[PDB]
Design a protein around this ligand. Structure first.
Ligand code: MG
Ligand code: MG
Ligand code: MG
Ligand code: MG
Ligand code: MG
Ligand code: MG
Ligand code: MG
Ligand code: MG
Ligand code: MG
Ligand code: MG
Ligand code: MG
Ligand code: MG
Ligand code: MG
Ligand code: MG
Ligand code: MG
Ligand code: MG
Ligand code: MG
Ligand code: ZN
Lengths: 177, 66, 83, 116
RNA sequence: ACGACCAGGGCUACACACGUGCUACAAUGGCGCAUACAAAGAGAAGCGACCUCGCGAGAGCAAGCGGACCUCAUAAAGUGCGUCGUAGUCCGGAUUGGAGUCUGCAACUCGACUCCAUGAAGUCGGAAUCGCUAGUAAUCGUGGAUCAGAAUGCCACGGUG
RNA sequence: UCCUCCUAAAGAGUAACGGAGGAGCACGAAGGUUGGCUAAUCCUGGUCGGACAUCAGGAGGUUAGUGCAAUGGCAUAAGCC
């Protein structure tokens, strides 16, 4: 809750100032962080899915929800109901603590990190990025690997616009560019 | 949260090469020694230097004199 | 490549044409058979029609074309494909 | 075992695991270990973390993976944009250095393309 | 003009096919250090010590030599120690980028060499086919002609065998 | 032989070698109940990942769904856990 305290003391004062909001509830806030791993190769075997949920459970200390196909498509050889991915929703303190370990540890552990994009905010403040490789998290041991995965992070916030989320993450010194 | 199903999520200490110390909750268990943190990452100076286009006329005039 | 102690190389008749077109400040195309002359920084902004064996192809001169020779921008073999 | 972004095998010696770095070879790895005062016959095993921090600083003196690959692609796109002979060779996929194209250009041209 | 002069280009192109070769796919080996034993040749618009600088190719000054006198020119494989420990590897070196040297009016097309980085294919080769009977094959280096420069070719030489 | 729509003339019914389609089962849960939920499609952003897997938001508001044909129904859902 270190970053939640930093939000509550300095980010709110900053954004109320730089936007001239009438109310403090008018301020943006982060709501949830969603961690998907779309695993389309688990149709070969469940153990690949079973290991991706084990890896992502080490990243965020939650058991992941194994997602399935909403419908059936033949280009990917799937039927409605096949387990095809895994997700984790992070809220509250576990959200903040992951967001701390992210922007403090893992983003520096990216090979050839040179910034993010500010053009990934889906028109309505919610930011989405995707990592190529799970070893940037230090939870994962490098020898203890099975397969180089990749996942994607989706930060869902209460910002109406795109810039209010851009200012919120910049208030958390989020490495755009 | 449920009781048993989630992994152990415990506060540990992570120290770095820049001498940063940060206590986080993690699933590692043991203490952690890092390599780069957000404090010591060369994103704000080094990546700025790391463009390095260089001039073609300046290489030319550098290689000799008329 | 050439040694640095000899410096660069350029034909004299080219270097005189460059000095003239520099002082006149004209960008008329200079036809030239000197494919072996290194481009100089004073050549920037000039159309120079380098020979290729058959004709004179015009070359607008850029900043980056300095440390090269004029023949690099006039290909001598035309190849489109076999089929 | 994590230098300049990438990991490094621990079981190998110093010069070799350094040569895993894109931008160093056995020469520059000797210059690194010479500047760190580290013997070459030791492993990445049984190294102090101060020794590895010195190693990271010595590698950080040079140009490496992301910088080096960016600079190389920039040089190539400089030739591409100029339209010189080396650029035409780089974008025709043909050998640049003045090699033979009648025979034995298989590194740049890949495997054989049968006339069908 | 089917003759003659000059510049530039080309003889080096490239979907492909063949011949002859070179280097390899390693552990009877690669690397690093130390160290032993050759023959036969060339040299004046030439061979070019020593010394100094340079990581280096090389540069400077510069002796000696038309040469059983001096130079090219330290032979390498070998042996000794350490090292890698079976991996596409510390094998392999292609390719490509950058920085350079020398020759030569001039190295873009289109030279050789050096340094740093890069690290393809390749893990012994289908049907088929070649050479060789002893100092032979195999393997290891050396020199010369042509030549300003430019050989894995050619012609010669000895080592192990 | 049986089912659905039209012909069929605003109750029912109504013929032709009239126009169009199906059935001769399935389910021990695909039944009962309690509790809860609400689609299709498209847009943007996002690791492998692509027109199309999974993820987040928005439009939309049932254009979806109903074990199977069609018709009538279905949000109090009869639809989905
Ligand atoms: Mg390397
Ligand atoms: Mg001529
Ligand atoms: Mg010929
Ligand atoms: Mg020296
Ligand atoms: Mg030896
Ligand atoms: Mg050895
Ligand atoms: Mg090697
Ligand atoms: Mg090399
Ligand atoms: Mg292979
Ligand atoms: Mg092998
Ligand atoms: Mg000779
Ligand atoms: Mg010669
Ligand atoms: Mg009726
Ligand atoms: Mg009636
Ligand atoms: Mg039902
Ligand atoms: Mg109910
Ligand atoms: Mg999409
Ligand atoms: Zn740090």
């Amino acid at each position: 809750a270190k970053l939640h305290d930093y939000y509550k003391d300095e980010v709110v004062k900053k954004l109320m100032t730089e936007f001239n909001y009438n109310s403090v509830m008018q301020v943006p806030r982060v709501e949830k962080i969603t961690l998907n791993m779309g695993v389309g190769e688990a149709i070969a075997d469940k153990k690949l899915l079973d290991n991706a949920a084990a890896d992502l459970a080490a990243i965020s200390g939650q058991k992941p929800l194994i997602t399935k196909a909403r419908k059936s498509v033949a280009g990917f050889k799937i039927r409605q109901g096949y387990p095809i991915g895994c997700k984790v929703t992070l809220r509250g303190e576990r959200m903040w603590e992951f967001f701390e370990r992210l922007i403090t540890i893992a983003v520096p552990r990216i090979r050839d990190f040179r910034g993010l994009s500010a053009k990934s905010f889906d028109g309505r403040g919610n930011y989405s990025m995707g990592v190529r490789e799970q070893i940037i998290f230090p939870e994962i041991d490098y020898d203890k690997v099975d397969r180089v995965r990749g996942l994607d992070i989706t930060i869902t916030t209460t910002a109406k616009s795109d810039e209010e989320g851009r200012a919120l993450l910049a208030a958390f010194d989020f490495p755009f560019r | 949260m449920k009781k048993d199903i989630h992994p152990k999520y415990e506060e540990i200490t992570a120290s770095c090469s820049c001498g940063n110390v940060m206590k986080i909750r993690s699933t590692v268990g043991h203490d952690l020694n890092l390599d780069v943190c957000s404090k010591c990452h060369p994103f704000f100076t080094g990546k700025q230097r790391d463009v390095a286009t260089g001039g073609r006329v300046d290489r030319f005039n550098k290689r000799f004199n008329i | 490549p050439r040694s640095l102690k000899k410096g660069p190389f350029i034909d004299l008749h080219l270097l005189k044409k460059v000095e003239k077109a520099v002082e006149s400040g004209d960008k008329k195309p200079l036809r030239t058979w000197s494919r072996r002359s290194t481009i100089f920084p004073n050549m920037i902004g000039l159309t120079i029609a380098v020979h290729n064996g058959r004709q004179h192809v015009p070359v607008f001169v850029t900043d980056e074309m300095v440390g090269h020779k004029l023949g690099e921008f006039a290909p001598t073999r035309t190849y489109r494909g076999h089929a | 075992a994590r230098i300049a972004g990438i990991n490094i095998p621990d079981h190998k010696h110093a010069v070799i695991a350094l040569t895993s770095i894109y931008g160093v070879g056995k020469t520059r790895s000797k210059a690194i270990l010479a500047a760190a005062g580290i013997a070459e016959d030791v492993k990445i095993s049984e190294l102090s973390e101060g020794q590895i921090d010195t190693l990271r600083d010595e590698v950080a003196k040079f140009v490496v993976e992301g910088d080096l690959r960016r600079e190389i692609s920039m040089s190539i796109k400089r030739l591409m944009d100029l339209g010189c002979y080396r650029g035409l060779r780089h974008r025709r996929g043909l050998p640049v250095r003045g090699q033979r194209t009648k025979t034995n250009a298989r590194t740049r041209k890949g495997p054989r393309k049968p006339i069908k």
